[PDB]
Amino acid sequence: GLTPEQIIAVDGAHLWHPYSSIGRSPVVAVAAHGAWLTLIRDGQPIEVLDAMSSWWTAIHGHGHPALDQALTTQLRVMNHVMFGGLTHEPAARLAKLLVDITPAGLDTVFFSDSGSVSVEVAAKMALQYWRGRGLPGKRRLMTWRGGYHGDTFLAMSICDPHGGMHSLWTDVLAAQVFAPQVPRDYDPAYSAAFEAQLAQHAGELAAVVVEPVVQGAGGMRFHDPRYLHDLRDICRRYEVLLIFDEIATGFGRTGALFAADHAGVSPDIMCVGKALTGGYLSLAATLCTADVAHTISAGAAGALMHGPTFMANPLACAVSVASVELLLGQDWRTRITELAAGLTAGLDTARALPAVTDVRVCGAIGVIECDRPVDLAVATPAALDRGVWLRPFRNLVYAMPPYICTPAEITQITSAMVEVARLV
Amino acid sequence: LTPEQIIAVDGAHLWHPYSSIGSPVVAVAAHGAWLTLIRDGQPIEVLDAMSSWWTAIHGHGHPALDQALTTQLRVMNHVMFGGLTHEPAARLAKLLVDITPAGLDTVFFSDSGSVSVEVAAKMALQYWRGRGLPGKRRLMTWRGGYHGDTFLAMSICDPHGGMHSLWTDVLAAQVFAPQVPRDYDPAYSAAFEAQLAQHAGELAAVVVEPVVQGAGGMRFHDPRYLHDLRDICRRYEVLLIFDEIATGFGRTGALFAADHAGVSPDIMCVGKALTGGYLSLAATLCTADVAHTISAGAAGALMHGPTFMANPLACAVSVASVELLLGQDWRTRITELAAGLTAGLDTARALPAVTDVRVCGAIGVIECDRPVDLAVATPAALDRGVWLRPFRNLVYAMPPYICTPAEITQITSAMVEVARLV
Ligand SMILES: *Cc1c(COP(=O)(O)O)cnc(C)c1O
Ligand SMILES: *Cc1c(COP(=O)(O)O)cnc(C)c1O
């Protein structure tokens, strides 16, 4: 065991954090329950709201009794078995649910252990698909700027070149095709231009890959769902697969079960993750259509050569089943609409603040965009004083709260955001 | 769902590893070294001779691991590792730093082995960029290797005999030395050095599996090669990366296979047995020098950060698994396992279809003169109360460390009968 001081000491010497350095200070978390984290501030444990849902994951809050129970129930019977030559109930139950609730036509599921991996699996499916059609020249990807798809090297290649620091990786990453930043408001001219650019690359392109409706890590930007309708149409006419990365948008977050639903379109391949397990454990999945699966499987190449060791882990699958069932068993649509309303009401006053350039809400996502970078040394202690854990990045103050947050809690979260923006 | 229903859903909707779409056996329980599987409508108990792909070193449902998991679950399932830290991450980092080859002082947690390999590569590239030598961006390895299924990991898989052979045209083009031989031959090392010499200015790192190459063909090599690799890399200023995702945590008879050579790499990857086979977790360790050079470079930071980085549940069960291993005389245990495998597999050498029998720690291998047909091997093993998963021309086992001598004997007996049927 360790005290918070010893935790800090070990951490400082030995632990890498996300996109950070060694030797160039994290706060100790000692507990988490419901929408609340218990953190150590100046030696004292304080409870603060998890306004980020621990990076989109904790949709039902932490330690939800239904999810805890599902995990302990599975733990008593079978922790894990290899998915090579064996199958099990949690995998089957989850696959059936996912095929049932995702956009029409996605009826095969490949489980993996993280979002980045599921994106690489998606790309491999796309590339292998065209090889299966005797068109191995179709091996590039196309996306629009502003996106994020994970940190592995292939995933990096489709991340926004700036957000992704591609300047530090020149000569290393695959060279992919980038369309301009998709605008917020629908402009048919944008889709016409996208089509024209894609058309000249069509014989070289395996797939278009995008985050539908909301671009998360790349800048919390929203775009009209009609663009997705356009992409589906362009992809169909030029024979390029469409891949939706719903790793952040999945499971109700944008006000629809999957953001694709806002557009009423179905991609050829889809990735889900983050909230899949209700934020308990790492699990991801890549779904594809019957046509994709068979075309791969009928290829001379044959099998899809991917197989994570912990593929379809019974514990992760079991909690995900429970997380998904819990979401489906409640009036989730009304819950998100309410959250969206609370965020809109709460954030409204920031729009008139001097440093604020935009205020936007989409389902259970609220964003204040400022006219300059947000100083974390100022923002964090402010938010903590107000009982809220916020993680601004760049010029963005934002939140994606647990679905279980009460009106009072949403008011607390937004009040802390508005204050952070005021201090900007 | 009943077993028949599971099979129905699975055939319709589930993609399995390394396979096409369009039958698996239903597993319904796991306890200790035993799986309960359903065969012809009836539950049967079979030994998990594969430790569930090399993960379940303490067996399934071990009370110490189960309780570590439920204890952590009561307190905190997960928080984002951005701006926060926690006891499970710190306890595990401290353990890993203490038990791995000397000099490995920093720990980057990720969710899978393939990711940890990409993290290792990113460390190496960023390191040289930090030194002002961005031309050092290629990797070198020897043939016969396997490092995962993500695109960077694939680039260092064996390019002809390896599982990723069909992708070679789209992968980064790396530098390959010939297959490392089993017995030590100074001429092999000299040739490796001569090859590396000509690429030194473009090489970020040498990356290899130490002592045992797993998925590439369960081949063993003399630890002395690792000593030469360390020497060569030091002299030519190329980083040395060991992928111990398969070999770690006692599997080869030493705590880490590098220990057989007394060598420390600059960067090291671990996974699989890290969590005792409960949950997915991996880690990439590097020296203080590598970390600082990255941190002081133009980037100012290592540009990677998985959503579930340092997951408290996975870290907590890993802590318990490592402590359980260290808290017993694991070396004697593995030596006893190895003796049992050796004695049990000895009669396979005489069989007509068997080309080699070899054992290294708790790994036992019968190499056959043809690819093993699973449709024949699987039922033959199940009839003998053992779950075996051959691949290529290999019938092999990596049993849980908790297997008794009788259980090892049952495992090796089934392997021999499988080899007899080939
Ligand atoms: C977070 C994210 C990923 C990467 O998921 P990891 O589990 O961190 O590898 C990929 N795509 C999107 C849209 C994401 O938000
Ligand atoms: C299994 C393995 C990996 C990859 O582990 P995954 O969890 O399947 O990504 C990498 N390297 C070696 C040596 C391995 O044995």
Asked whether the beta carbons of B278 and A79 are under 8 A apart, the reply is yes
Asked whether the beta carbons of B418 and B388 are under 8 A apart, the reply is yes
Chain B residues 238-297 with a CB less than 8 Å from chain A: 271-272, 277-280, 288, 291-292, 294-296
Q: Is B417 left (phi over 0), alpha (psi -120 to 50) or beta?
A: alpha
Is there a contact between A62 and B52 if contact means CB atoms under 8 Å apart? no
Closest CA to A273 of A259, A258, A283: A283
Is there a contact between A282 and B60 if contact means CB atoms under 8 Å apart? no
Query: Tokens 């205020």, residue?
Result: A359
Report the C-alpha gap between A128 and B145 in whole angstroms. 23
Asked whether the beta carbons of A214 and A249 are under 8 A apart, the reply is yes
Name residues contacting ligand 2 (CB within 6 A): A 308-309; B 112-114, 117, 146-148, 209, 214-215, 243, 245-246, 271-272
Count CB pairs under 8 A between chains A and B: 390
Q: Which two structure tokens, joined as six digits, stand for B47?
A: 């030994």
Ligand 2, atom 5, lies closest to the CA of: B113
Q: How many residues does chain B have?
A: 422
Sequential DSSP letters for B39-71: ETTEEEEEEETTHHHHT-TT-BS-HHHHHHHHH
Q: Give, in order, the Cα–Cα distances in Å from B169 to each of A124, A156, B151, B166, B177.
A: 13, 19, 12, 8, 19
Burial class for B28, CB neighbours closer than 10 Å (0-12, 13-18, 19+): middle
Closest CA to A262 of A290, A240, A239, A232: A232
Domains of chain A: 1-63+331-424 (3.90.1150.10), 64-330 (3.40.640.10)
| Ligand of minimum distance to the alpha carbon of B112 | 2
Query: Tokens 């490392």, residue?
Result: B180
Chain B residues 37-96 with a CB less than 8 Å from chain A: 37, 48, 50, 52-56, 60-61, 65-66, 69-70, 73-87, 89-91, 93-94
Closest CA to A403 of A296, A297, A326, A316: A326
Q: Active site includes A245?
A: yes
Query: Tokens 């952040």, residue?
Result: A248
- Is A238 assigned to a binding site? no
Asked whether the beta carbons of B249 and B281 are under 8 A apart, the reply is no
Residue type, B189: S
Beta-carbon contacts of B365 under 8 Å, excluding residues fewer than 6 positions away, are: B218, B356, B357, B358, B359, B394, B395, B396
Ligand 2, atom 7, lies closest to the CA of: B113
Q: How many residues does chain A have?
A: 424
Report the C-alpha gap between B392 and B372 in whole angstroms. 6
Q: Which two structure tokens, joined as six digits, stand for B186?
A: 């100074």
Q: DSSP code of A204?
A: G
Q: Active site includes B18?
A: yes
Name the closest residue on chain A to residue B155, using Cα atoms: A153
Bridging pattern class, strands B42-48 and B34-39: antiparallel
**Catalytically annotated residue among B127, B136, B146, B259:** B146
Name the closest residue on chain A to residue B129, using Cα atoms: A168
Residues of B within 8 A of A17 (CB-CB) are 81-83, 85, 305, 309
Resolution rounded to one decimal, in angstroms? 2.0
Report the C-alpha gap between A221 and A146 in whole angstroms. 8
Mutation test of ligand 2: which of A309, A310, A313 has the most ligand atoms closer than 8 Å to its C-beta? A309
Report the C-alpha gap between B362 and B252 in whole angstroms. 6
Distance from CA of A32 to the nearest CA of B (A): 5
**Catalytically annotated residue among A50, A113, A230, A245:** A245
